[PDB]
Amino acid sequence: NLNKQVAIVTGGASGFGAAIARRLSQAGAAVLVADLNAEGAQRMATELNAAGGRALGMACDVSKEADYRAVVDAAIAQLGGLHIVVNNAGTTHRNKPALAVTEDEFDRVYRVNLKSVYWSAQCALPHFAQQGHGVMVNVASTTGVRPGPGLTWYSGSKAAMINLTKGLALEFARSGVRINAVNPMIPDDVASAVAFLASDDASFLTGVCLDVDG
Amino acid sequence: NLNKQVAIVTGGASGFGAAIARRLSQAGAAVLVADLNAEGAQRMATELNAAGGRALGMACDVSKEADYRAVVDAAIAQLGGLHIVVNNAGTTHRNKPALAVTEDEFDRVYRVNLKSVYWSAQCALPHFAQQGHGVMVNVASTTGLTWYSGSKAAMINLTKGLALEFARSGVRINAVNPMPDDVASAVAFLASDDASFLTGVCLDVDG
Amino acid sequence: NLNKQVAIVTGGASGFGAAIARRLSQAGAAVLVADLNAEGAQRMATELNAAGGRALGMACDVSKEADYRAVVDAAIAQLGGLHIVVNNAGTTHRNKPALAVTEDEFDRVYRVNLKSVYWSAQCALPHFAQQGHGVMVNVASTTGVRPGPGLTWYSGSKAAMINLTKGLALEFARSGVRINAVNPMIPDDVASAVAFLASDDASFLTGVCLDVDG
Amino acid sequence: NLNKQVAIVTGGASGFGAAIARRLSQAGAAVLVADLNAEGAQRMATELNAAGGRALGMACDVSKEADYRAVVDAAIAQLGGLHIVVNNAGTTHRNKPALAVTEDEFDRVYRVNLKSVYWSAQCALPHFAQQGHGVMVNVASTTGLTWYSGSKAAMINLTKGLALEFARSGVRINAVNPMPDDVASAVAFLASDDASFLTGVCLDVDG
């Protein structure tokens, strides 16, 4: 149960982010839905609101400090605090050979799947440390069990993000702040995993990556 | 015997990359010494030529396409081909709390190391695939879990992914994980025909 | 909450097994405490009973099919069913160099940390499959993070047990039966991990090994 | 060049172990062919001696101390020493539901493979430690997650643990993971001085 708790969910307009926002709001948390797409973010918030929830939509490029700080400040100021930060990876776009991935796609993966976690760390972790509680859950991009070709550059930055998440966790391990990760492997099970990890029943877990059925 | 083979060594002017440049030259291989410091690259090249080897030094920001393509085009045009690419792109890093890490400090570890493997793949592996043979060796020099420990995991992961994407192509892609002689030995082994049964493998060795 | 649920906990008289038995009984489960030591098993059951619980002690060599079948039958007949099976690894005994480990210690590790999981599979899994629900949690022996010398033969059979647990899980994955594992790495966090994995809130997890602070 | 070196190859009468026995003999190394079938071991030994090599065949249940100690004592007494031990002890296994696996079927995978590495360590590594040099190579032949997939993980894990427990001893402990030429090549490499910078390493190669 996450009553009186505030969550930011990035990637919130679609995919795993929308399912995660739905689940956390169903558990009683106030949700700031953050997404590149302001309209998609607002639609998800309207849906959560129509269903009994308290939610707000906000546009945000998780690669930009200012966008990520503004979403943290918006959650604190207008929803009244921040206790949970869920960073959603993208939809992995299409599967194609390593040498067909253009620079723009490579760059986007870096921005959305690694740089976002760095800014999340810089923008949300001090608040958590200050209040002596908080949870960050990083949802990796979806890679197959024993993955084959087609996701080489995704699997690369994914391995980096999971290790950064475990590294951040060791630093914050005696702060009350828990930093954990979800590895969707080919939406209910992804959302259930995030909702459990955000709950106080997961208080004994940090620096963990939970493999779940994508 | 890397005689009759051309090798590009990134980060070649010092550290693991200098030691690799020397071992590979000593094995009889032409070597394009690539590094961020043109002066140091030229220095290593002159030493190698002075030791009886063949070598050209070029300034190269591995995070930039033009720089990597230059190093590749030069090796094919001036050194006479390309059969080996060694990617050394890590640096030392004082472990400080992650909230003291500036964006640049972060990009230098995650953005440079990853994109260097990216440009290495876009720029050099088509030449390997065209001739049906070639070896990429990615030394994870980035320097227990720290904020920067993810570069090494990605380098290893990318090595294994690229290797699968080049299965049965005659193109082998391998890694070295230094935890410098033993590093240069593992590179020279992996770059040699004696390692033709090995692709997608990471060799942990004492640094 | 594990009300109206029956758990077998092996290794139950001491160590992580006792902490796990305490936690599961505190959550409402009936506990058959199984242990090599009949008296230690009975003492733990008496403690759980004095605290509000329903518990029974029973001697059992988890390396022997007959001992393991008798504990399953005892739980079904006298506590009224079986839904949870926790296999506790040993205390890792002492840390000593690989070549100082005698054959008797090597043999004991195999029996307690691997053969037990095979019999648990043969003796408890058909019952779970029959009823279409059930959870098995295998608690590995405690190994350090990035472990050094001293636990070579433990770390060997531990790696085997965790892979067997993931293998068993894939087989039973569409049966309602969840097979999961806990890796104590140097007792509350071990017991919390087992209690969560045994609950219906972990229903979306199978074939997972949870690293936790030992 | 394994000339001037003695090697014990377990499971030597067929499969990966025969191919290893031949490659190592061809490298100039005396070879004690150890296997569960004495006749087949003697056959391989005769073939190797007939090819100009030196070899003795012995029946050996690797799960038993006396059998492994015999193979070790014989190699030191009849073949003139011991510098290499290759552990092949896996077998093929039809994947069936785990509830159809009999206790014996389970012991044959988990008990034999693990205890074989145990006796290999108790029986052979003291000789290596005494002379300050030696190489143990553990080929994980036990044959995606299955009930028997844990043998391979243990073999790799034990290899890395033993290697750490023998750091700086001149005694190297390595593994090969066949997913037979490429297996025998990786064994012969790992057993040779060319691999002296490698301990605690598992080489994945196509089987």
Residue numbers in the entry:
A (entry chain A), C (entry chain A): 2 to 187, 221 to 248
B (entry chain B), D (entry chain B): 2 to 144, 151 to 186, 221 to 248
Task: Please give the exact wording used by the authors of the publication that reports this structure.
TsaC, an annotated short-chain dehydrogenase/reductase (SDR) enzyme, and TsaD, an annotated aldehyde dehydrogenase, are the next enzymes in the pathway. These proteins have been suggested to perform iterative NAD+-dependent oxidation reactions on the primary alcohol products of TsaM to produce 4-sulfobenzoate and 1,4-benzenedicarboxylate, respectively. Importantly, TsaC and TsaD also recycle the reducing equivalents used by TsaM and TsaB.
The crystal structure of TsaC was determined to a resolution of 2.18 Å using the structure of meso-2,3-butanediol dehydrogenase (BDH) as a model for molecular replacement. In the solved structure, there are two copies of TsaC in the asymmetric unit, each of which showcases a Rossmann fold and contains a central seven-stranded β-sheet and seven α-helices. Based on an approximate interface of 2837 Å2 (16.2% of the total monomeric surface area), these two subunits form a dimer, and like that observed in BDH, this dimer and two symmetry-related molecules assemble into a tetramer. Similar to the structure of BDH, and as described for other SDR enzymes that are considered classical members of the family, within the Rossmann fold, TsaC contains the expected sequence motifs for binding a nicotinamide coenzyme. However, decorating this binding site, and following β2, is residue Asp36. This residue is positioned similarly to other negatively charged residues in SDR enzymes that are credited with favoring the use of NAD(H). However, in both chains of TsaC, the hydroxyl and amino functional groups of the Tyr155 and Lys159 side chains are located approximately 10 Å apart and do not appear to be catalytically competent. In agreement with the observed inactive state of the catalytic tetrad, approximately 30 residues between β6 and α7 are too disordered to build and are therefore missing from both monomers in the refined structure of TsaC. The equivalent of the hinge residues in TsaC are Pro185 and Pro221, which bookend the unresolved loop.
